[PDB]
Amino acid sequence: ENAXXXX
Amino acid sequence: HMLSDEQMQIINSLVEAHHKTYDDSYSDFVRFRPPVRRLSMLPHLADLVSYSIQKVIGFAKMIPGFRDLTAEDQIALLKSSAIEIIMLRSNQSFSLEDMSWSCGGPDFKYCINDVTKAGHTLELLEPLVKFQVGLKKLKLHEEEHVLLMAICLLSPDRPGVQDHVRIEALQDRLCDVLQAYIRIQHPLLYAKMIQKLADLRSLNEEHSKQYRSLSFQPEHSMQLTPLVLEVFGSEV
Numbered sequence: 001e002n003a004x005x006x007x
Numbered sequence: 008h009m010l011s012d013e014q015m016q017i018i019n020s021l022v023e024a025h026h027k028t029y030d031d032s033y034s035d036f037v038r039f040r041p042p043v044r045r046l047s048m049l050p051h052l053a054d055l056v057s058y059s060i061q062k063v064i065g066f067a068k069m070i071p072g073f074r075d076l077t078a079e080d081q082i083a084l085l086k087s088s089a090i091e092i093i094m095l096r097s098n099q100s101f102s103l104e105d106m107s108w109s110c111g112g113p114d115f116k117y118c119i120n121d122v123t124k125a126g127h128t129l130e131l132l133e134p135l136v137k138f139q140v141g142l143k144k145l146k147l148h149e150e151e152h153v154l155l156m157a158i159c160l161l162s163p164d165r166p167g168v169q170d171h172v173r174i175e176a177l178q179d180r181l182c183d184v185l186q187a188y189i190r191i192q193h194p195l196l197y198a199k200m201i202q203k204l205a206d207l208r209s210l211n212e213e214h215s216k217q218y219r220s221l222s223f224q225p226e227h228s229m230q231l232t233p234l235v236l237e238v239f240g241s242e243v
């Protein structure tokens with residue numbers, strides 16, 4: 001999954 | 008004895024940042040997993056803290072200069088200070104009359120007993136409540152409250168920080184704003200506020216200690232959120 005990308 | 012236009016705009020930016028990221032109605036709390044009273048309060052408080060971490064991220068992004076830092080520096084600052092900013096920002100819901108955090112209704116009123124049902128002991132909750140009392144007695148203006156949060160977040164002495172000089176220069180400018188604000192508005196408070204930052208370090212330590220015992224039990228770590236696991240985790 002696309003998790004620090006909430007920078 | 009006068010606040011500069013840039014210093015005034017820094018305060019305006021921070022107050023506006025806090026208003027955009029702190030909802031006094033607490034109407035979003037109904038979307039958390041419900042509180043119930045083996046660690047019955049962990050799901051609700053995990054959602055509460057996870058929700059608050061995302062608010063702290065939005066607040067940090069609106070701090071003047073924070074966006075100019077590298078992505079790695081922004082993440083390192085937030086990871087290390089998130090629990091402290093949450094403890095600071097929670098003073099707005101803390102009440103000396105109740106000695107608890109009141110967030111609109113009895114379902115969302117959190118006392119020490121509630122947090123023990125989330126895996127934490129009095130070794131953390133007692134100093135945390137004593138901290139909330141001492142901070143509440145300072146009667147900080149909203150300007151001082153948000154400046155203290157920005158100063159806490161822009162601390163240069165945090166694990167994983169690369170550009171220590173640039174971050175300290177940003178924090179130093181925030182401290183000069185706070186000192187100039189206090190001199191104008193309060194004809195000792197600054198030393199009291201700086202002391203609270205040292206208190207937050209001790210609370211950060213004890214929470215990290217107790218979070219490790221919590222997160223090392225698979226039955227409990229799986230009740231946390233992805234954001235909580237990443238921010239409070241030891242991953243570098």
Ligand SMILES: C=C1/C(=C\C=C2/CCC[C@]3(C)[C@@H]([C@H](C)CCCC(C)(C)O)CC[C@@H]23)C[C@@H](O)C[C@@H]1O
Pocket residue numbers: 049052053055056059093094096097098099100101108110117122125126127214218221235
């Ligand atoms: C969130 C905020 C609020 C209360 C903060 C509290 C009350 C309950 C217990 C808390 C959440 C402490 C707990 C020790 C944190 C434990 C989290 C975990 C279980 C993952 O280890 C830290 C702050 C305390 C409400 C509102 O002020 C927003 C603020 O933003």
